[PDB]
Design an enzyme around this catalytic site. Structure first.
Site, PDB file in Angstrom:
ATOM      1  N   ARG A  99       0.643  -1.086  -0.115  1.00 45.68           N
ATOM      2  CA  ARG A  99      -0.037  -0.035   0.044  1.00 45.68           C
ATOM      3  C   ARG A  99       0.933   1.142  -0.157  1.00 45.68           C
ATOM      4  O   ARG A  99       2.169   1.450   0.308  1.00 45.68           O
ATOM      5  CB  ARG A  99      -0.949  -0.042   1.104  1.00 45.68           C
ATOM      6  N   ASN A 107       1.575  -5.813  -2.416  1.00 44.04           N
ATOM      7  CA  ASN A 107       0.243  -6.076  -2.276  1.00 44.04           C
ATOM      8  C   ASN A 107      -0.593  -4.675  -2.336  1.00 44.04           C
ATOM      9  O   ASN A 107      -0.151  -3.806  -1.451  1.00 44.04           O
ATOM     10  CB  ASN A 107       0.035  -6.820  -1.119  1.00 44.04           C
ATOM     11  N   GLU A 108      -1.503  -4.436  -3.169  1.00 46.20           N
ATOM     12  CA  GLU A 108      -2.465  -3.513  -3.257  1.00 46.20           C
ATOM     13  C   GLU A 108      -1.614  -2.159  -3.531  1.00 46.20           C
ATOM     14  O   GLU A 108      -1.739  -1.176  -2.779  1.00 46.20           O
ATOM     15  CB  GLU A 108      -3.258  -3.291  -1.664  1.00 46.20           C
ATOM     16  N   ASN A 109      -0.845  -2.248  -4.488  1.00 43.90           N
ATOM     17  CA  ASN A 109      -0.012  -1.092  -4.794  1.00 43.90           C
ATOM     18  C   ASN A 109      -0.771   0.025  -5.461  1.00 43.90           C
ATOM     19  O   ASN A 109      -0.231   0.972  -5.719  1.00 43.90           O
ATOM     20  CB  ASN A 109       1.128  -1.605  -5.500  1.00 43.90           C
ATOM     21  N   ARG A 113      -0.572  -8.975  -5.648  1.00 46.48           N
ATOM     22  CA  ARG A 113      -2.041  -9.138  -5.723  1.00 46.48           C
ATOM     23  C   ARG A 113      -2.450  -7.664  -5.658  1.00 46.48           C
ATOM     24  O   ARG A 113      -2.054  -6.538  -4.958  1.00 46.48           O
ATOM     25  CB  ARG A 113      -2.294  -9.382  -4.228  1.00 46.48           C
TER      26      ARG A 113
END
Ligand code: NA
Ligand code: NA
Ligand code: NA
Ligand code: NA
Lengths: 806, 803
Positions: free
Chosen positions: B368, B404-406, B443
């Site tokens: 993130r 993840n969730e970039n 992801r």
């Protein structure tokens, strides 16, 4: 990176300032004529340019090591839509900083690797500013180059060459479309029987606009430029690394030193807004070093017939042009060279391309050259230059060796010398080379306590020069090769002051002891101290080195286990550590003068190493021989012909058959009577394989009068060519007899309209120079006017010559 | 090497907060002097700053500096040897001091790293300052988990960025010559019948020993040799290729039969014999284009979970024994795949995945926030390289994750998709340069889904979005967008011990057919469109049905590589202060102290062959409804047939059929009698010729309840010095409020202490009721206490505890 027709050499409309500015503002600020801003005065130059074009060989000054600036106004007009503007440096010495207007856009430390700077964003920011009006649509580009001495930067100032400064290799303006290639790597391998080649085409994209898809075509053409493979990858992601193709070629055409043949890989990247094509060449060849044995190219033993070169030339120092490089490499190939070690650093890619095209195998090394080992910045520089060299020159089939350093046992750039630290860093570099490219061998020269680390090792063997006698060459080589798995001998030879000759080359050399080695040790290269040795006691005539080279080459025909050797160097080059050489500040071991004039030794190599029929009587630059009346003088002919007949004044002296082992001159020697006065010597040869006849002719005077000590300088106008005059000085004794053995230093000066053509680093282009057989020549540019030349020599009356223009 | 490697666990002290300089850690300090404050706390390693305050409901967990100090007794058994501090992992920025000398530093909470302290130890022991330390060497370590936008991971992440020496710190004695790296390159031929192993090493040789004899031995699963070679007089410096060998008919590593080889390296000089070893496996993996996943040439449905390094009472400072128990619990549930949360995990975990047969996706914590500057990018590159280099040899690993969730913004005032793509592709390229035998993945970053080898979107059907019956169709749509689809993260929260007679009661506003991806705001308990995450009762009854549905759908998805449930075990997170257990993500099928939830047995009944049988409702004491209502009873079992008995009366035999949802056909509708009931289930598995049984007891309540009126508090049980206290919410008429979710607050005054801040529904001093009930344990300390029980708007109730 790799382009084509979008690459523009920036050669014109530059100015150069020796020394530093107080800040980038001084390069770009408004300056009215006659104002304080109008000094310092810059010098208009054409690139490539070197700070040291003159002062490296000027006999009275230390060459400049410091900062200097270049400025131009760039005319930018990118032919590509939304394209990139890249400055591509073939090479610049040594620390470089680049400015667009007042913005620092790039920096580099390393004088010999290529590097580039994308200036697109800085140009845009400048053009959008109120300051742009004043530059009339152009963009000010200012570049600072700095070759200040720096113990924490390689190479070391202990090295035997100039650490040059400036924009001494081409600087290219490269226009690119949105998507281009940052790197193209062609991995080629050749199967065991050599009938199957594998090519992997890998690339890194340059894609600052983040284009998501492109169509990429990979095509491979053979040596005749006929296509053998083509594949288009549709909708590939043109970002970062991509493997584009893997292909197998049955019966590939092999690259060889006698028949260099290359394939071409052509890559195209297409979007709706661009079609961008570039090409890269490669070759298929198999190389093998045998354990305790010789070298094999494409499954057959090949004796490496090697030389070296520095990037250095008369009048320009490191700033050689492409035409100069082509001429030099063509001269090497015509001499029979099949191997070169590229001095102590990565060289211009023009040189590497020429080695691929001409068939010359390559050892290329980083400039970790003497001094010991520095701190973290020093080490980071060495790693970076090794990686850059391998990445940049990976595709050249000529390259067989990546060198890691030279004479790393030479201390004193630091107050400590730690062998274990040097070993540890040497192993790190070796490991990095094999990590990057395990298809090539690593090597070093002269660091015995590291000889277990590298793949290929060279000791120091200077038989007949820095130590011992040259007849020990073979035995020293036999002893040395047994110490390492793969032995390759780089650097040997001797200095010759071009145009200096001797009736007895061994006159002061009869008591050099044989059987005590042949390596250069600390103090041997200096002019003082040590033990008897040709480098110190020899006359430095061409006559000695011709015999030394002759010996080495005939010995190599009987050394079947030998990988090969490389003579040091091909061409005379400037060095800061030899102020007292016959040409000051020039290493004179070349077989070619610093201005491309071949020495007599060039023909020795050519006679042994080539098949094209040639013939060369020794003594083209030897105008006056001497001795007793009716003495039978030795005449040597260097020729690859099968039989040669010699004529003296039209009278046959008999036919002789060539036999390399019948030393000297491979049996082509005669002992003949010269007439007092002028003689014409003619040699006629036939080469049976070629069914060809060739001839050579020289004219020589013969003097029987003996001379006393030098008493006067006789100065005369020898000839003229347009605006240039050739002046000759002859040292004579009190009775007017020419002092044919004199090595006395002569000094030229001029007053008036003309100028000396001096500081070329050649025996005929030097304003202070040792005489060659009592004579010295220099050319004068008369400038269509009148001058007086003065000729000085210590303890002798100064002599004068007027030069008038018609 | 176990003989040379010493876990430094005892005789440490810990200080929360910073010192003014290293001198404060080592200066002379008399009792009662100004130097005697601040007061340090004795600790045993491993230790985490946040063992308590991560789940404490009333404070933000500590993100800042803290110090550790010990006195080391040094005795190197090797002549002229090395002394190395080897960190399994420490959070997040660490600085190491020997006496007053800074000897090492590290940024990254999840990769391993080491420090050679040989010279500093020698310099200290030879100094005048050594006398006052009585032969010992002072070691002081600063760890810092301060918030830092230019350091990964992001504080936007759904987990604690923990601080401290929370993985083992080892003292390692080495001889003159040792191995810095051992790399085992294994590949397996087309027919699986030829294996190739390359053994590469990097030497550690500070004394520049010129020659050594090196032995390479390879052993099979029994530690018996298949290869042995001695290299005499090798140069033990830098990199060396030690061996390349072909193994015919190698034993393959498999998730059901995990078999490992061991490579043992010995380096000998006249002054030393030093041996170390590394394990590896042979196995072939293949992701099919627009298709499923193959292990050793056969399709394998990945049956996955996740885990965080987090546990009750200790936060990240889990012991080896705790890790072993957790991974065994996973294997016994039928897991064959794990994504190791958002970061590199302890090598103990990787070794256990190798040994138990659990395939692995392991990623860097680029989790993130967007994309930072040069230091941020350098850290991500470094942690990626470290993870691949350090874990390269584990056969379990099939995927290196890059983030993840970039697509989740707001750690910076800018968000540049093109810059994120460029750096993502650089990381992808680096992974393939280092290790081309594994796939990269990310992801939930759709604008990067063309960069990596394997891609997971966000599919949280029936939780953060949509209904769980859309799971298959959403998965069908998503798999078509990418070459290799692998679904990581799905599930739902359940407050352990909370159950519901109508699991779908307040889920009327939720809309189907419009995706199941978590978008911005979905994770929050406020705002957003109706979704079970916000509107569900958070009962185990709902998540059991959600999981049941997912697993039976996966039996009809032949193109599916597999999935990974999120997570195996409840774990603490700083962004959920209002959860039923504050600051805990309660999506686990196991509680934060290893207690299985009812959902554990759903997975087990679908994923294992060992006969088991589990009546739903072991932690459901009181059911409810109308008199003579037919209550649904679910049994989760892998048996072929199950017979149910209610109060001794058979309710008939039912045959198991996964597609007969729910409970794979093993469901009954039976009348409960008011009062206590005994439900018994007997199953038989024909393949094993084995019978297994389960039994539960449940009360049945027909009385309806009004709003909560009072808290009834009682001593439920006692064990030694521990008391179990129960709260029951009742209405104005005394009827148990069996649907109450009201928050209960426990306080104590006196000799005892609450066993709280465990992050479990029975270990929380502030906790939502489960069916009107709340439990907590009290350590009485052999004395007297009064417990107070508070609930908003209700009279506070009190319970005296005597010993
Ligand atoms: Na000079
Ligand atoms: Na230097
Ligand atoms: Na908290
Ligand atoms: Na952060």
């Amino acid at each position: 990176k790799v382009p084509a027709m979008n690459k523009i050499r920036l050669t014109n409309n530059w100015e150069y300032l020796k020394g530093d500015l107080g800040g980038i503002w001084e390069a770009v600020r408004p300056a009215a004529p006659g104002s304080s801003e109008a000094v310092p005065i810059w010098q208009p130059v054409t690139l490539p340019h070197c700070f040291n074009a003159e002062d490296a060989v000027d006999p009275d000054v230390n060459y400049y090591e410091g900062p200097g600036w270049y400025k131009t106004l760039l005319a930018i007009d990118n032919p590509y839509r939304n394209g990139r503007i890249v400055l591509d440096f073939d090479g610049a010495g040594q620390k470089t900083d680049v400015y667009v207007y007042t913005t620092h856009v790039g920096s580099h430390v390393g004088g010999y690797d290529s590097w580039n700077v994308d200036i697109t964003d800085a140009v845009k920011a400048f053009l959008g500013s109120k300051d742009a009006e004043r530059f009339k649509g152009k963009v000010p580009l200012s570049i600072r180059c700095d070759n200040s001495r720096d113990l924490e930067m390689i190479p070391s100032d202990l090295a035997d060459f100039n650490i040059y400064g400036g924009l001494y290799r081409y600087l290219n303006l490269v226009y690119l479309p949105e998507v281009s290639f940052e790197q193209i790597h062609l991995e080629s391998s050749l199967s065991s029987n050599l009938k199957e080649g594998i090519l992997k085409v890998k690339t890194s994209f340059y894609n600052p606009e983040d284009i998501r898809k492109a169509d990429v075509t990979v095509s491979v053409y053979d040596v005749d430029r006929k296509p053998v493979f083509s594949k288009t990858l549709e909708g590939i992601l043109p970002l970062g690394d991509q493997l584009l193709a893997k292909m197998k070629i049955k019966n590939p055409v092999l690259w060889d030193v006698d028949v260099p043949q290359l394939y071409t890989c052509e890559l195209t990247v297409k979007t709706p807004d661009q079609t961008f094509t570039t090409e890269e060449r490669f070759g298929f060849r198999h190389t093998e070093f045998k354990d305790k044995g010789p070298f094999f190219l494409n499954g057959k033993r090949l004796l490496l017939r090697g030389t070296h070169r520095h990037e250095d030339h008369a009048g320009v120092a490191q700033a050689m042009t492409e035409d100069m490089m082509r001429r030099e490499m063509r001269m090497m190939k015509d001499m029979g060279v099949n191997f070169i070690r590229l001095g102590h650093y990565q060289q211009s890619e023009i040189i590497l391309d020429l080695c691929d095209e001409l068939g010359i195998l390559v050892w290329e090394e980083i400039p970790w050259c003497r001094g010991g080992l520095g701190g973290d910045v020093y080490k980071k520089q060495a790693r970076r230059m090794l990686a850059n060299m391998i990445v940049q020159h990976h595709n050249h089939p000529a390259v067989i060796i990546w060198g890691l350093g030279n004479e790393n046992d030479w201390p004193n750039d630091f107050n400590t010398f730690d062998k274990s630290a040097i070993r540890a860093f040497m192993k790190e570099l070796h490991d990095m080379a094999h990590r990057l490219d395990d298809t090539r061998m690593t090597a070093i020269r002269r660091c015995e306590f590291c000889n277990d680390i590298v793949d290929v090792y060279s000791p120091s063997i200077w038989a007949g020069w820095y130590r011992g006698v040259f007849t020990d060459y073979k035995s020293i080589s036999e002893q040395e090769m047994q110490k390492v798995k793969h032995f390759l001998h780089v650097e040997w030879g001797g200095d010759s002051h071009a145009r200096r000759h001797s009736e007895d080359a061994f006159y002061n050399l009869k008591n050099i002891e044989a059987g005590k080695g042949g390596d250069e040790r600390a103090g041997d290269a200096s002019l003082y101290g040590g033990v008897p040795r040709a480098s110190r006691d020899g006359d430095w005539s061409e006559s000695y080195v011709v015999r030394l080279i002759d010996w080495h080459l005939k010995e190599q025909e009987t050394m079947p286990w030998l990988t090969g050797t490389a003579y040091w160097p091909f061409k005379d080059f400037s060095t800061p550590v030899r102020p007292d050489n016959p040409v000051p500040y020039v290493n004179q071991k070349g077989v070619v003068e610093r201005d491309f004039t071949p020495k007599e030794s060039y023909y020795v190599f050519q006679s042994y190493w080539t098949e094209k029929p040639m013939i060369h009587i020794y003594g083209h630059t030897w105008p006056v021989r001497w001795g007793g009346k009716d003495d039978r003088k030795e005449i040597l002919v260097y020729s690859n012909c099968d039989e040669v007949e010699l004529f003296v004044n039209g009278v046959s002296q008999g036919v002789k058959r060539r036999n390399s082992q019948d030393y000297p001159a491979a049996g082509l020697r005669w002992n003949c009577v010269y007439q007092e006065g002028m003689n014409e010597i003619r040699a006629v040869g036939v080469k049976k394989k070629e069914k060809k006849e060739v001839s050579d002719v020289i004219r020589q005077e013969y003097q029987t009068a003996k001379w006393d000590k030098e008493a006067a300088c006789q100065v005369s106008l020898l000839s003229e060519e347009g605006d240039t005059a050739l002046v000759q000085v002859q040292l004579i004794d009190k009775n007017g007899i020419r002092c044919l053995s004199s090595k006395k230093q002569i000094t030229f000066e001029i007053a008036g309209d003309g100028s000396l053509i001096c500081n070329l680093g050649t025996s005929t282009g030097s304003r202070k120079v040792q005489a060659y057989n009592g004579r010295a020549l220099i050319r004068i540019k008369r400038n269509e006017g009148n001058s007086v030349v003065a000729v000085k020599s210590e303890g002798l009356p100064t002599a004068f010559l007027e030069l008038k223009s018609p």
